[PDB]
Design an enzyme around this catalytic site. Structure first.
Site, short mmCIF file in Angstrom:
data_model
loop_
_atom_site.label_atom_id
_atom_site.label_comp_id
_atom_site.label_asym_id
_atom_site.label_seq_id
_atom_site.Cartn_x
_atom_site.Cartn_y
_atom_site.Cartn_z
N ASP A 171 -5.26 12.07 1.09
CA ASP A 171 -5.63 12.05 -0.34
C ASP A 171 -7.04 12.62 -0.51
O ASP A 171 -7.94 12.29 0.30
CB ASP A 171 -5.57 10.63 -0.92
CG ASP A 171 -6.39 9.59 -0.16
OD1 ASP A 171 -6.18 9.44 1.08
OD2 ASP A 171 -7.17 8.86 -0.82
N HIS A 181 -3.94 6.37 -1.81
CA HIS A 181 -4.64 6.42 -0.49
C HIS A 181 -3.62 6.65 0.63
O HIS A 181 -4.04 6.99 1.75
CB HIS A 181 -5.48 5.17 -0.25
CG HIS A 181 -6.81 5.40 0.40
ND1 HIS A 181 -7.52 6.58 0.28
CD2 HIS A 181 -7.62 4.54 1.07
CE1 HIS A 181 -8.68 6.45 0.90
NE2 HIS A 181 -8.75 5.21 1.42
N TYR A 231 0.83 -1.23 0.00
CA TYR A 231 0.00 0.00 0.00
C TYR A 231 0.85 1.27 0.00
O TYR A 231 0.29 2.36 -0.27
CB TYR A 231 -0.90 0.04 1.23
CG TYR A 231 -1.96 -1.02 1.18
CD1 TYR A 231 -3.03 -0.89 0.31
CD2 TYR A 231 -1.89 -2.15 1.98
CE1 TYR A 231 -4.03 -1.85 0.27
CE2 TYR A 231 -2.86 -3.13 1.93
CZ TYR A 231 -3.95 -2.96 1.10
OH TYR A 231 -4.93 -3.91 1.04
N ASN A 279 -9.78 2.61 7.19
CA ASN A 279 -11.19 2.77 7.63
C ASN A 279 -11.28 2.61 9.16
O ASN A 279 -12.42 2.76 9.66
CB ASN A 279 -12.17 1.88 6.87
CG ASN A 279 -12.10 0.44 7.28
OD1 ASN A 279 -11.27 0.07 8.11
ND2 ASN A 279 -12.94 -0.40 6.67
N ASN A 321 -12.85 7.38 3.69
CA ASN A 321 -13.11 6.30 4.70
C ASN A 321 -12.21 6.47 5.95
O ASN A 321 -12.62 6.04 7.02
CB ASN A 321 -13.06 4.87 4.09
CG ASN A 321 -11.72 4.41 3.54
OD1 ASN A 321 -10.90 5.23 3.15
ND2 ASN A 321 -11.52 3.10 3.39
N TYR A 352 -5.22 0.24 9.43
CA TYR A 352 -5.89 0.32 8.10
C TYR A 352 -6.75 1.59 8.05
O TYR A 352 -7.23 2.07 9.08
CB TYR A 352 -6.62 -0.97 7.71
CG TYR A 352 -5.64 -2.07 7.46
CD1 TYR A 352 -5.01 -2.19 6.23
CD2 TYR A 352 -5.28 -2.96 8.45
CE1 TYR A 352 -4.09 -3.19 5.96
CE2 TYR A 352 -4.34 -3.96 8.21
CZ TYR A 352 -3.74 -4.08 6.96
OH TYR A 352 -2.80 -5.04 6.70
CL LIG Z 1 -8.71 1.48 2.36
NA NA Z 2 -9.39 0.43 5.18
#
Ligand SMILES: [Cl-]
Ligand code: NA
Length: 196
Positions: free
Chosen positions: A98, A25, A20, A73, A119, A71
């Site tokens: 972002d 993101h 990631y 969210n 999120n 993470y």
């Molecule tokens: Cl995400």
């Molecule tokens: Na997430």
């Protein structure tokens, strides 16, 4: 605790893991890691707050940095207890993230408002309210609503990455205004940025 609108907590939003690290993101992570390196703030393992955090001097001000490791969210499960423990009011918080609603190479400093469908912000605003500052790093929109996941978890083409990187570099040069409580001027100078 925090003091007025002297920014004393800078949060970067994103997802943990190498897979990631390069995705849109993670724009917030890019900004806070670059800021940490600029001012020699160590980002260390902070399991008590489900994050990676630091504390150091930015232009004569004691400032904490936080990357949630929850993470995206679940970002509020790091940000909220961190800010409560250190008695940091939302008015002293900057969250870098972002922004789907803006072009690569556009960057804006916003105070208040909604999550805009983000999120990460959606997991934060319910607990501390909206009255924190945001560094909105343009990442472009993909078109459609299911296409969103594929876009924010995508690695940008080199031209878009260059545009974001230039905007992030500009915002790094204005953090001095933010930690000094000069939010209006930092808003004028960040929001005026053009890539070319
Ligand atoms: Cl995400
Ligand atoms: Na997430």
């Amino acid at each position: 605790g925090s003091h007025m609108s002297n920014i004393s907590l800078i949060v970067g939003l994103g997802n943990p893991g190498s897979e990631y690290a390069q995705t849109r993101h993670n724009a917030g992570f890019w900004f806070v890691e670059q800021l940490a390196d600029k001012y020699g703030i160590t980002l260390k393992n902070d399991p008590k707050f489900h994050g990676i955090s630091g504390r150091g001097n930015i232009e004569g001000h004691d400032v904490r940095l936080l990357l949630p490791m929850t993470y995206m969210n679940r970002s509020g499960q790091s940000v909220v207890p961190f800010s409560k423990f250190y008695q940091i009011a939302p008015e002293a918080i900057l969250i870098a993230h972002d922004e789907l609603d803006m072009n690569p190479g556009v960057i804006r400093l916003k105070t208040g408002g909604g999550h805009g469908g983000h999120n990460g912000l959606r997991d934060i605003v319910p607990h501390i309210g909206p009255n924190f500052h945001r560094l909105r790093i343009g990442i472009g929109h993909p078109g459609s609503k299911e296409r969103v996941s594929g876009h924010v978890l995508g690695k940008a083409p080199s031209n878009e990455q260059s545009l974001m990187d230039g905007a992030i570099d500009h915002a790094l040069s204005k953090v001095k205004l933010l930690v000094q409580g000069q939010v209006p001027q930092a808003m004028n100078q960040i929001n005026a940025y053009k890539p070319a």
